[PDB]
Amino acid sequence: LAVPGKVIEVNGPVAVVDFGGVKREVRLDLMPDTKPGDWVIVHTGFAIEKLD
Amino acid sequence: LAVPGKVIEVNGPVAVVDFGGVKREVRLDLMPDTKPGDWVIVHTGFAIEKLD
Amino acid sequence: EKIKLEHGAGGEIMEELLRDVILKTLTLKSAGGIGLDALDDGATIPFGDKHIVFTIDGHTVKPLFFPGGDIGRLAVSGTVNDLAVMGAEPIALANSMIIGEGLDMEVLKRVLKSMDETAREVPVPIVTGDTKVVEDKIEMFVITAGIGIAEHPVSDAGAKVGDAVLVSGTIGDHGIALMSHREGIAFETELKSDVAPIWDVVKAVAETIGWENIHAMKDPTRAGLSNALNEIARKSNVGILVREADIPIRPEVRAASEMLGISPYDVANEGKVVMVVAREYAEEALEAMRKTEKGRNAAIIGEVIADYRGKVLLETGIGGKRFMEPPEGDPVPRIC
Amino acid sequence: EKIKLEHGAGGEIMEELLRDVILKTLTLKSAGGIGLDALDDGATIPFGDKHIVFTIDGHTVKPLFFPGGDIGRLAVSGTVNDLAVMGAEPIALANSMIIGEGLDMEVLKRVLKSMDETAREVPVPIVTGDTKVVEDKIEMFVITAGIGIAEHPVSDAGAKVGDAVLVSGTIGDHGIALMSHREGIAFETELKSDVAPIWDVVKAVAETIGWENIHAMKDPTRAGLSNALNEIARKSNVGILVREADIPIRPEVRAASEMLGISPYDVANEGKVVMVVAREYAEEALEAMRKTEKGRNAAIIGEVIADYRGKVLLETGIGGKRFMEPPEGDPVPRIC
Amino acid sequence: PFEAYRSREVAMKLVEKIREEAKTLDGEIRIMHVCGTHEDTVTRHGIRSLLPENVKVVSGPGCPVCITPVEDIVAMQLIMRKAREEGEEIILTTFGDMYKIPTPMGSFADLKSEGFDVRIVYGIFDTYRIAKENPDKTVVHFSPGFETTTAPAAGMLNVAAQEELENFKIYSVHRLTPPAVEVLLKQGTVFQGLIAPGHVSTIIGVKGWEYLTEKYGIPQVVAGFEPNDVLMAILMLIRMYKEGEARIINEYERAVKYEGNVVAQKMIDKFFEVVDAKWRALGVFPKSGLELRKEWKDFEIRSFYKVEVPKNLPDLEKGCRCGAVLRGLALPTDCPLFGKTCTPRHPVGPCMVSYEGTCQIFYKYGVL
Amino acid sequence: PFEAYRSREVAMKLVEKIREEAKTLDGEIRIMHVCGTHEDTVTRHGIRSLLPENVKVVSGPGCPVCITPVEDIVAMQLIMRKAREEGEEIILTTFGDMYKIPTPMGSFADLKSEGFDVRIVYGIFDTYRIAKENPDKTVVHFSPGFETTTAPAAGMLNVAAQEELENFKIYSVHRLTPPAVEVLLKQGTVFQGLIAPGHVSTIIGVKGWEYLTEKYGIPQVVAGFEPNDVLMAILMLIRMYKEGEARIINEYERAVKYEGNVVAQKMIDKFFEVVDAKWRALGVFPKSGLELRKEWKDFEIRSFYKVEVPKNLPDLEKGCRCGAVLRGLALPTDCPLFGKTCTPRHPVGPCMVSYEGTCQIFYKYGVL
Numbered sequence A, B: 001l002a003v004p005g006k007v008i009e010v011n012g013p014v015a016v017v018d019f020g021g022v023k024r025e026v027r028l029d030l031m032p033d034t035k036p037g038d039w040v041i042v043h044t045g046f047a048i049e050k051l052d
Numbered sequence C, D: 001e002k003i004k005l006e007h008g009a010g011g012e013i014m015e016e017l018l019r020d021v022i023l024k025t026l027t028l029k030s031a032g033g034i035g036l037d038a039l040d041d042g043a044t045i046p047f048g049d050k051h052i053v054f055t056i057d058g059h060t061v062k063p064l065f066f067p068g069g070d071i072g073r074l075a076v077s078g079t080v081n082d083l084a085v086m087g088a089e090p091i092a093l094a095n096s097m098i099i100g101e102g103l104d105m106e107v108l109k110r111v112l113k114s115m116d117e118t119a120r121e122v123p124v125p126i127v128t129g130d131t132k133v134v135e136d137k138i139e140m141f142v143i144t145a146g147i148g149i150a151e152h153p154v155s156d157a158g159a160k161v162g163d164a165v166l167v168s169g170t171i172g173d174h175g176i177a178l179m180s181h182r183e184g185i186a187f188e189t190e191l192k193s194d195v196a197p198i199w200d201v202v203k204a205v206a207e208t209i210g211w212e213n214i215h216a217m218k219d220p221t222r223a224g225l226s227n228a229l230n231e232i233a234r235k236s237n238v239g240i241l242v243r244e245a246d247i248p249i250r251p252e253v254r255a256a257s258e259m260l261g262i263s264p265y266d267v268a269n270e271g272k273v274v275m276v277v278a279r280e281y282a283e284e285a286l287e288a289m290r291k292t293e294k295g296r297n298a299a300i301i302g303e304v305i306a307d308y309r310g311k312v313l314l315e316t317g318i319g320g321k322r323f324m325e326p327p328e329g330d331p332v333p334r335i336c
Numbered sequence E, F: 001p002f003e004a005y006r007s008r009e010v011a012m013k014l015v016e017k018i019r020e021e022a023k024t025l026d027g028e029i030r031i032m033h034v035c036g037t038h039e040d041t042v043t044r045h046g047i048r049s050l051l052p053e054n055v056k057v058v059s060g061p062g063c064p065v066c067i068t069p070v071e072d073i074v075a076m077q078l079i080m081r082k083a084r085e086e087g088e089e090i091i092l093t094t095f096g097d098m099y100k101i102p103t104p105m106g107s108f109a110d111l112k113s114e115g116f117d118v119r120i121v122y123g124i125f126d127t128y129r130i131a132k133e134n135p136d137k138t139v140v141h142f143s144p145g146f147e148t149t150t151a152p153a154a155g156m157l158n159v160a161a162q163e164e165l166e167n168f169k170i171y172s173v174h175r176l177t178p179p180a181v182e183v184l185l186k187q188g189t190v191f192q193g194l195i196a197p198g199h200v201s202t203i204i205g206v207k208g209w210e211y212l213t214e215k216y217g218i219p220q221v222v223a224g225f226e227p228n229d230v231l232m233a234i235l236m237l238i239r240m241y242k243e244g245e246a247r248i249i250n251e252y253e254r255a256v257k258y259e260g261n262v263v264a265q266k267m268i269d270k271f272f273e274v275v276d277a278k279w280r281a282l283g284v285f286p287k288s289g290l291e292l293r294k295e296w297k298d299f300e301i302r303s304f305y306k307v308e309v310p311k312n313l314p315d316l317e318k319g320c321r322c323g324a325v326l327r328g329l330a331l332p333t334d335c336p337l338f339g340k341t342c343t344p345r346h347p348v349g350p351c352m353v354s355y356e357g358t359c360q361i362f363y364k365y366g367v368l
């Protein structure tokens, strides 16, 4: 059950995504280029792609 | 809290005393001469004396 | 500060908790009648020409089954009695159950069966309920609330000086039977619990001497007869003289209590009622009781006096005098 | 055969237990009104010009404290609501407590405080109670019974074809907040439980469109809105069409439910009411609700239909159609 | 945001176009998706009730937990016992649904009840953390999943080698989607269009699915998971069928790159190698599984324990038709056990247990 | 049976004679009993309220659990810990009240809560049984008690040697009643008559108490425990005082032999030897304790463990007056803690904890 979230914090591998009032930490190991403001697809705690 | 009971069964060291509708097993190690019909004083599961 | 087993043993320590916390924290405690503050067997709610009696009781007896009864018969019996000692006729029961994950379906069925058989004896229907299941290893808990209609309500504070004190039967049976059952103490014939609804007993006396002459009542459950009496003395602010030689006690109960080192006066009864009646109606109430299947062994045990107000005086067999102290808490664990 | 967590989750599996055992074993189940067999939010007892509503509910929510409320506010809220959805005005509460040996006295005080604050909001007094303490490591269990007076009683079977279906507020808040709190799922602003008494909400609608026009009601607690609806459909033997796009759901709840993989329709709500009203009174009831502090978010979600009797039809956002299945059991453990 | 992708208007338009393009269609068109999340979308939004009688959407084996061999589940359990007897206590992490997956010899939950340390985790990182909090114990993660789940494991294995962790092991039961799809082709599973899984695409990109449309001429369409993504894909597919087209449209361009996700691809390649694997209830599919390479063999829990898994372990319970459900050849309602002895609470087959299981999805949503 | 011994008539007669013999009495007569069961009889039946102002009944140290040194209770606990560290787990049996007896360092119950195996038993046979059911463990019984309780232990030790049991050990804390009685004499405890304990007499018979009435001229009276036994004894004592008599009357002849109980005497002698012992809150009384002889030393739990018990362990909590209660010099109601912070449920001193404790008895019965 993957859902979209807006990145509001990056710290190397870890990131803080907000899914509409609900925030969770996500590993950016597969989306190094990630950065605040982005919108990633999170699967099992990992960002797998950004949205355009 | 020692209470009187009527012996209704003997089997060497063990005995079965009735304390008014309540029966319990008692060691006769200190009252070898005990035998059915007797009335002993039971203390911590041992017969310590018969009544006259 | 932690909650101790004593805080729920119906004795003095539990009285502390009620006064030190419960009654002290709850601020809205009545509906125009006897309320929480009174700590009576139930509450009363004026409803025109009559009153509604409201009572609730949790049950956590272990084991769920024991000689003479079970948690199911106890739930129905306990609630009906509390309504009955308030002077109300059982109208309906509400049954809540909290079952532990894993209980054998057969146990639940057996409990429900007993509840049913017991409820039909009153008779009184179980009109609503609730079922919860928890992972906690608790087997089962039964909480029963009940509503009843009382033409004339009776409270623990109506005892008057000169009145006579009665019990509907033998004292100490439920608590001693259950304790004996635990310690494997075998009998010539098993000592049974007395758990049973006794509305018919109260009703009989009332249908004989009239409600106005029943000045006080209480089923002596947790903490026994001593507690039920000490509770009436305090609230009615009267003294109570009890003659040990007149308190009905089965031989088996006397025996087991001695071995158990506990007093049959401090343990719960689940099929009895203490009744304070007008001095000139004692004999008729006694006989009215003796004529019921559950009051065959009723007996006048004492009288309400003017000295030692709030206390319970005990006249021993040899004629001595001492107070019948309200236990700190029921001696037996999970007695109800 | 063993009892499973599912048997007390308020879903279908629990329905089996009630039908396979409880209702099947108890034989006396009514007092001249809505009884146990109806499995309504409470029972009714005719008393001349009016009826007495009788309800009881156990509570075993863990942890005892959670965002937005606690087991104490829940006990009072739950009982008052069940009386309220029957169309009765809370009269009195009966409170039973089963405390685990060792509970910190402060916790008990904090729970009692919340119960008190909550009870005063109705307002409704706690006129009688019971306290038990067990060695079992359970912390605390709160069982509350309540009596209320209903001029005109409402049941889950009064829904008529053409009627409109309403909810007093957002759906899924209590169950999702509690689940999120468990899995440490943090929020921009914590998702709170909605636990609260909503008699004022029901009363308002009644004091606006009259009791005769409130054909059915039920607080969607265990098993959620889907369950409450599926229950009304079956008993009223009518079908129910619900438009997913009109069901009020907080953004935070939608989000957490997706991550949690559960539907906000299948989890308990502790501060809401489902109301089936006469088609020509829907708007006034809605507005009457919108004017209360707890019904600001009320909304007409559907209508009673003649097809698919006993089932609940869901019209999805994109316009598709599917049934809103009554959960097998509430997804969240110890939700209440 | 993305409101359009859920818009009741955008949907009712797509539904109308689809109806139009089909009212003139002869025979029947069958579109197969191979992602449980798509099945959830289709079923949750009641999309089937919006389709024309001659247009069908079937769910393929888009459930990694459903297809994990029982032989592998039993193996993991045998190793837990083998370790116990060797004084070594292992910490086993598994996903929630996998935790309850049945086998002839019981599930991971049945094990838990025997005093073994089995923990449910939402991702591999959870397992990684447990590894650092319990150095006095070997933490192992039974790892099933498709490309989308393989990646987080391929990345966690990197972060583990650098850190030089010795108590971070996993039982690989990873599978590849494209291969299984081909196998179904070579076996008669009927469908004229393929809705390629959104997320597995995100990883292997549109490129990973080309070898299929080229070698069999099947029109594929990478789609997202909003209701309009699937409706779009269906329309797009109906048209490439009517016009005899045979190409791949990336409807999910907002989330997928043609090349896909390079890092993950090599990240996975750095540790796993395509191998022959068995799919539960389906058979042994060629080059469809992923196992740890000879080097990163120290990360495989089986490189420390060799167990004898009994032969002839039946894949499913008698009466269960999950194998056919997995092939898109059967509906869960066709099953005699569906909603009877088999439900999410008390499942008989894996298709009902899994979150992406087609049976669980049908049950959970009250299909018409 | 024995109805007379409880007869309200027989009692009211004895009460009248007593009043008669005392209305003419000058000064005050003080009768001391040294058996908690007698205190229970006196208090339970409200006998004190039937006595004339010039006749007093005081309770001596008739409570073996109350007087067991804290040093011994702590020792046993230290040995439980010492065994644990030595891999050896011990099964400790104790009586119910002893189980809760407080010490500066906690009770046996406090130990139980630390994961130690402490079991409450009603007698030594219980302990013996546990020994046979748990051969893979050393079962030990903290054994306190007077002659009446010593005997069952002296008999169980015999049945144990024959059986040649190696896991049947006990910590002896046995005490002798007659000695302590003499000590109280040499220390001023005032009383002109002694109600000798019924059951301890049954064992040592009337003969065991003679050395006292002869060496100090104190009139002793062996009595039973029915209310009329004690009333009789009181009357008998008042008269031997008025007539200057100085002998021993065996009012409990129905249960006691002059020589007492020979078997038990030798049974006890075969294993224990009178030694100097400390009485909690009272001091070290000469030849008042019983310890296992050098031969049967293998039955003593201390012959397998040597622990260092800290010095200066206070005998009682501040404010507790159990020491004076034990001497019959104080009433529990004289104590500031009585019924306040000290109750049977939450005891401060040993006198309140013990079943034969004078404080517990006063509390339990609501003394006037």
Ligand code: SF4
Residues within 6 Å of the ligand: E319, E320, E321, E322, E323, E325, E332, E335, E336, E337, E338, E339, E342, E343, E347, E348, E349, E350, E351, E352, E353, E359
């Ligand atoms: S319902 Fe159950 S039993 Fe039928 S195939 Fe689906 S999982 Fe197998």
Ligand code: SF4
Residues within 6 Å of the ligand: F319, F320, F321, F322, F323, F325, F332, F335, F336, F337, F338, F339, F342, F343, F347, F348, F349, F350, F351, F352, F353, F359
């Ligand atoms: S009451 Fe307590 S504290 Fe006072 S002496 Fe008796 S036991 Fe010691």
Ligand SMILES: [Cl-]
Residues within 6 Å of the ligand: C057, C221, C222, C336
């Ligand atoms: Cl009670």
Ligand SMILES: [Cl-]
Residues within 6 Å of the ligand: D057, D221, D222, D336
């Ligand atoms: Cl509920």
Ligand SMILES: [Mg+2]
Residues within 6 Å of the ligand: C040, C041, C042, C082, C218, C219, C221
């Ligand atoms: Mg009562």
Ligand SMILES: [Mg+2]
Residues within 6 Å of the ligand: C040, C041, C042, C055, C056, C057, C082, D129, D130
């Ligand atoms: Mg009550």
Ligand SMILES: [Mg+2]
Residues within 6 Å of the ligand: C057, C078, C082, C221
């Ligand atoms: Mg009660």
Ligand SMILES: [Mg+2]
Residues within 6 Å of the ligand: C129, C130, C131, D056, D057, D058
């Ligand atoms: Mg309920």
Ligand SMILES: [Mg+2]
Residues within 6 Å of the ligand: C040, C041, C085, C086, C154, C155, C156, C216, C217, C218
């Ligand atoms: Mg009363």
Ligand SMILES: [Mg+2]
Residues within 6 Å of the ligand: D040, D041, D042, D082, D218, D219, D221
């Ligand atoms: Mg309800």
Ligand SMILES: [Mg+2]
Residues within 6 Å of the ligand: C129, C130, D040, D041, D042, D055, D056, D057, D082
């Ligand atoms: Mg209800």
Ligand SMILES: [Mg+2]
Residues within 6 Å of the ligand: D057, D078, D082, D221
């Ligand atoms: Mg409810």
Ligand SMILES: [Mg+2]
Residues within 6 Å of the ligand: C056, C057, C058, D129, D130, D131
């Ligand atoms: Mg009660």
Ligand SMILES: [Mg+2]
Residues within 6 Å of the ligand: D040, D041, D085, D086, D154, D155, D156, D216, D217, D218
């Ligand atoms: Mg209703």
